[PDB]
Amino acid sequence: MALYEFVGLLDAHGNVLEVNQVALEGGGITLEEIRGKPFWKARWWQISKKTEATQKRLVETASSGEFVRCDVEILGKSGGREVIAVDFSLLPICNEEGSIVYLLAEGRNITDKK
Amino acid sequence: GAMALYEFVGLLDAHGNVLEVNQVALEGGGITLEEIRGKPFWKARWWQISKKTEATQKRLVETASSGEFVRCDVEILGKSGGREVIAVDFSLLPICNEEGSIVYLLAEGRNITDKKKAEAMLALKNQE
Ligand SMILES: Cc1ccc(C)c(C)c1
Ligand SMILES: Cc1ccc(C)c(C)c1
């Protein structure tokens, strides 16, 4: 399976901790703008109030241990100018005790097709 | 619940090749992501104190790759652009995908040099 295009590390509550350069560039965001704040508040997810609410719901789902995978549109190309379709996933990351300590957000472009 | 925040963090693929590293870890070791991306974590400057520390990180990454959680105190080249040694509480967390395969490893590091040094002053004050 091809490596992600977009990756982000969130805490268990969905706060942004780390994001790769490709995601930062494509949404036109700096890590300092979004670090420590909820992921769904970042520009990728801001097409509308509903895309933000959708993302908030997927994060909360991951926080409680459910793996998420779905197709979503984000402001994710040319510095936040262009919408792309992304195959999106959230992986809860657990410690040995089984506690969710981080979430891993991954994204892979699917716009070229179709 | 809560946990002390990492200071160093990195994402490796299942075989320990470097995918992502935060700015604090890169500047502590004096390296750029581009120097180490796509190559084994154990080759990165942090682990280059000797052939041994290198060899050791390699085995830990292989352990984590098979699904075992790793955690140990170790000294790395992690301050003044990779020139000075610091003690770190080090962990490697295997990350499984929905399908159950290990897809990544998350390397974390908290600097514990201050805590070791205090421990040692106080053990001294204990005899005196
Ligand atoms: C960090 C990150 C991961 C995954 C996605 C879709 C985005 C937009 C950002
Ligand atoms: C990313 C990273 C680099 C170096 C170290 C020691 C740790 C713990 C994490």
Residue numbers in the entry:
A (entry chain B): 41 to 154
B (entry chain A): 39 to 166
Q: What does the study report here?
A:
TodS/TodT, a two-component signal transduction system, is responsible for regulation of tod operon expression in P. putida strains. TodS lacks a transmembrane region, and its N-terminal PAS domain (PAS1) binds a wide range of effectors, including toluene, to trigger increased basal autophosphorylation of TodS, leading to a phospho-signal relay to TodT and ultimately transcriptional stimulation of the tod operon genes by interacting with phosphorylated TodT in the PtodX promoter region (11–14).
We further determined the structure of PAS1 in complex with the antagonist 1,2,4-TMB. The only difference between PAS1 interactions with the agonist and those with the antagonist was found at the Phe46 position. The aromatic ring of the residue in complex with the antagonist is tilted ∼80° relative to that of Phe46 in complex with toluene in both molecules A and B (see “Discussion” for details). In molecule A, the Phe46 aromatic ring is tilted ∼80° in response to the antagonist 1,2,4-TMB relative to that of Phe46 either in apo-PAS1 or in complex with toluene. This change led to the formation of a salt bridge between two amino acid residues, Arg148 and Glu146, on the β5 strand, whereas no such bridge was observed in either apo- or agonist-bound PAS1. The phenomenon is probably related to the flexibility and lack of electron density in the STR region of molecule B of PAS1 complexed with 1,2,4-TMB. The ligand-dependent conformational change of TodS was also supported by the changed overall features of TodS complexed with the antagonist 1,2,4-TMB, which showed mainly oligomerization (bottom).
